Symmetry: C2
Subunit: 357 residues, 2 copies
């Protein structure tokens, strides 16, 4: 039961890469109870395909369901959580599928290019609307960790703690490569129509293929060996699903189409791979030297997307700027998805991160 507010109505959002957006709807949810001191507020930043709803109490499973709730690491008895769909998203916050106020048709190909710096400005405006003037913590994994990192730079005294799970401050060359293949799969779909597909058939073939590729970067080869190995589908096909792992990828690629928009996927992939914490500052050292928060950074050693090399490059850059840094690492079969799955290994890191330990 997502909440909504229209912002940037009387003054547009000026985007880092140029051009502007007006009448930005922000979809968001809150959980728990803000205390009298108002000192227990936590911002949750979602990952690439996440949305405003990490948790439900009524029987549904949110994207962080088993990590969140009464007495759990994301403790709804303790904190007041705010979670919002990013600018450029497709689950309520203004994105390329939204109606362009200037045309009455979806933005589509006309949606401006956005970066994490824009996304966090929208989140700041939301918190201003909600009357939250300081945060106990900001927490996010993956693309959400980049949002948390950017918050730490842009609003250095606004939060006590930053909890960055499984992200680096720069995306690797190889990871850019995967994003590139995913974008090209979408854009070369015969129904893409340059991004203006909303009045016709959507680019389902390309988006489902892109999603399958993304999924192959999110866990580990060991996890897939355990789940499927070389099990075969009973009546498979050579040019379709023959192995069980192929069946699973095809099923999940198709299921993804029910919940995501191709243009949003393109815009957020580019925000992710373009992310540069130095943008708007003299250089990265100057940007990171702004950070005053207690900063927790967690590396999964088996992550195949944000690999240890990237996490260590980030660790070094943060240390070089004198960040109050607390770095932790461990292996997980779940690789990049571990921050969403491996509660046993993340529980203490999250609990301690939020609390200032």
């Amino acid at each position: 039961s997502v909440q909504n507010v229209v912002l940037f109505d009387t003054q547009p959002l000026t985007l880092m890469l140029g051009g502007k957006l007006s009448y930005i709807n922000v979809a968001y949810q809150t959980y728990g109870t803000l205390n009298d001191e108002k000192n227990n507020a936590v911002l949750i930043c979602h990952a690439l395909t996440g949305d405003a709803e990490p948790y439900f109490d009524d029987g549904r499973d949110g994207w962080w369901q088993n990590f969140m709730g009464a007495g759990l690491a994301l403790d709804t008895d303790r904190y007041f959580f705010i979670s919002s769909n990013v600018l450029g998203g497709c689950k309520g916050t203004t994105g390329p599928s939204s109606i362009n106020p200037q045309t009455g048709k979806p933005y589509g190909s006309q949606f401006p290019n956005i970066v994490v710096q824009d996304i966090v400005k929208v989140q700041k405006a939301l918190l201003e609307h909600l009357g939250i003037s300081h945060l106990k913590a900001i927490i996010g994994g993956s693309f959400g960790g980049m949002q948390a990192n950017q918050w730490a730079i842009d609003y250095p005294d606004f939060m006590d703690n930053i909890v960055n799970l499984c992200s680096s401050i720069y995306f690797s060359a190889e990871a850019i490569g995967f994003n590139h293949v995913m974008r090209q799969a979408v854009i070369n779909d015969p129904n893409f129509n340059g991004g203006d597909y909303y009045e016709g058939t959507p680019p389902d073939q390309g988006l489902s293929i892109a999603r399958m590729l993304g999924m192959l970067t999110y866990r580990t080869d060991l996890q897939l060996a355990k789940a499927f190995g070389r099990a075969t589908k009973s009546d498979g096909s050579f040019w379709g699903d023959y192995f069980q792992v192929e069946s699973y990828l095809s099923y999940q690629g198709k299921k993804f189409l029910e919940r995501f928009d191709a243009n949003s996927y393109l815009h957020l992939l580019r925000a992710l791979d373009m992310y540069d914490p130095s943008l708007g500052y003299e250089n990265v050292k100057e940007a990171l030297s702004r950070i005053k928060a207690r900063y927790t950074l967690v590396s999964v050693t088996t992550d195949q997307l944000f690999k240890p090399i990237d996490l260590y490059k980030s660790k070094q850059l943060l240390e070089q700027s004198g960040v109050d840094l607390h770095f932790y690492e461990f292996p997980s079969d779940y690789g990049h998805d571990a921050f969403l799955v491996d509660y046993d290994q993340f529980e203490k890191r999250i609990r301690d991160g939020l609390a200032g330990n």
Copy 2:
């Protein structure tokens, strides 16, 4: 200047998965001089996108150019090398782009499904034609290593030495996943026309995307970080090439179209991921227990496609069947491509492998 011979004319090749092929042209090349004892013959088996020409002496660069020649690891002063394009290929040996003798049009969608067991039967027939009744060695990397492995099983006393570089006897679940995405990229190209595209526009979009994905599995993230890092293209585009790594992938994907056929790519991907040395035998242990050759297996520890987990699973299976096994491993920035690039680390392994050391 490839040589050609038509085989399986008076008796068709019966394929493992059913159905038959007649009038199979085999494109091949020989190098060096067969000695009077005829005991210096070596079969080279090419990898997924390789062909019959690993070497040229006239100025051109073959696919194994810097490893091969006078006094080099693949020593053309010492051995008589035979190299042939695989069944299902597109560089001279009968494949889906070849004319179907029964229709006068390319096989296309009518090309039968093939496996490594079929490919090696064609190679055996070629050697019979050439009057080679025993080999000093068989050598191949990647998909070529699978061909070498299969030779060792099917014709156990036909060769002294087997040199298997960077392949396992089974493809992993994750690796199957990548093949699946690559196949779907091709098949969902608007010009694929179910595989019968030869009279129209070829599926260039899908094939170039598939190739880009393949390339991201063939080296290492470190190698890409060294080559490109986050360097940008001077006048890039958001939905096209923005980073230098993207430019490179797009350029190489396009260049690949000049030399490869989409249907061949599909057929060989399936031969690779379906490869099962137990096929036609009671089980894998029975199959591998047939091997009598001195068997060299090399693992690149940084290989991101045939990962150490797979190479060790293979090592164990070969040992369990009492194979005369000689296993070596080392890291390389070039990962799966190291057997084609990293001469410094492969030179001794190849030299020793061929010679019976």
